[PDB]
């Protein structure tokens, strides 16, 4: 009959850790004879290489020692303990992420230079992937009295009310123009503003009147 | 080389927006998700169930974020004392600064008592720390987000 030499700590199974760090999955036992450690990825038996970089686990010290992990790891893990008057098994929970330690990645052509009528009313995208909380602000490349770029060899901008709300897309960072006189025919700027570094794009924007050639 | 559509026709390959959706707050420490009860104290847990786990986040600027629920919309704070309990109303007492530390852990620091270094970690059983009682290092104060449910 075995039994688990260490209970009290074997209630965390939640295992939830950054990629590429060995893990060490274990659970001690004993009785009469020794029993047997079983185990199993997912729910069926864990090769001793089942997956890349492949593991060396210590069927002594009743653990799994698995390296480097890899989302592609995140398995509830369970242990098996067989013995000719008792089995007893509990499961461990692993999973696995990998951190995007950077700026704020926002996709390309995003926002895009785009043309429209006076009194048209358009909008501006931004798709940002970006682990940490980002901070997105849409900048208006305006020109102070004379020149666009000031004493700090970086361009004169201004923040934008937002133009509206969130409704359309929840994935996507949209700035709503509306009258759009010839007067919105600036430059506007994405600044997706982030714990790690700043990232960020711009596009134009063009109005005019009713006919053409 | 296997692969699929979508990501093979995407404009786009990572998550758009992926920061707007709401995650849960692990902690290294124990294994629980940081909890803003209903009644409005906070506290670990381990029940990938537990109603007030999802956690939403924001930022009105760079590194300072917002932690709040998606059942309620208790904005998370820290008292004078170093309590975390949870506002109704956004106030200076809710800002937290968010740090990537190199064990890629995340890292919460009571903007307010940021000079004292007061961070949002859990006491082993799984109970809130007191500001004061966190130190910088101890697994108490490593969190690490999650996704609702699980793959």
């Known amino acids: ?120 009313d358009v909008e501006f995208h931004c798709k940002v992937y970006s682990d940490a909380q980002p901070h997105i602000q849409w900048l208006k490349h305006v020109e102070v009295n004379g020149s666009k770029v000031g004493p700090d060899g970086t361009p004169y901008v201004t923040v934008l009310k937002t133009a509206g709300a969130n409704t359309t897309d929840k994935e996507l960072e949209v700035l709503s123009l509306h009258n759009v006189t010839f007067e919105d025919a600036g430059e506007y700027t994405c600044l997706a503003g982030n714990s790690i570094g700043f990232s960020h794009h711009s596009a134009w924007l063009v109005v005019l009147p009713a006919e053409e050639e | 080389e296997i692969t699929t559509f979508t990501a093979l026709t995407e404009k786009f390959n990572l998550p758009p927006g992926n920061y707007k959706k709401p995650k849960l707050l692990y902690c290294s420490n124990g294994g629980h998700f940081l909890r803003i009860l209903p009644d409005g104290t906070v506290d670990g847990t381990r029940d990938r ?63 307010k008592h940021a000079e004292k270094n007061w961070f949002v970690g859990l006491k082993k059983n799984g109970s809130c720390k007191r500001g004061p009682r966190t130190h910088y290092g101890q697994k108490a104060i490593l969190f690490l987000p999650l996704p609702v449910s699980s793959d």
Request: aromatic share 8%; charged share 20%.
């Open chain 1, 1 to 120: 009959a075995p039994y688990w030499t260490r209970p009290e700590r074997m209630d965390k199974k939640l295992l939830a850790v950054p990629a590429a760090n060995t893990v060490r999955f274990r659970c001690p036992a004993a009785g009469n004879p020794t029993p047997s450690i079983s185990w199993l990825k997912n729910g069926r038996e864990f090769r001793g290489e089942h997956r890349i970089g492949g593991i060396k686990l210590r069927h002594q010290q009743w653990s799994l020692v698995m390296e480097s992990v890899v989302p592609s790891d995140r398995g509830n893990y369970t242990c098996v303990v067989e013995n000719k008057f008792g089995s007893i098994r509990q499961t461990y929970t692993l999973d696995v992420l990998e951190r995007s330690p950077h700026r704020p990645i926002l996709q390309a052509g995003l926002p895009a230079n785009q043309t429209a009528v006076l009194g048209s």
């Open chain 2, 49 to 111: 169930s537990d109603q007030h786990i999802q956690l939403q986040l924001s930022a009105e600027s760079v590194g300072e974020v917002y932690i709040k629920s998606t059942e309620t919309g208790q904005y998370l704070a820290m008292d004078t004392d170093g309590l975390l309990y949870g506002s109704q109303t956004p106030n200076e007492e809710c800002l937290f600064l968010e740090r990537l530390e190199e064990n890629h852990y995340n890292t919460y620091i009571s903007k």
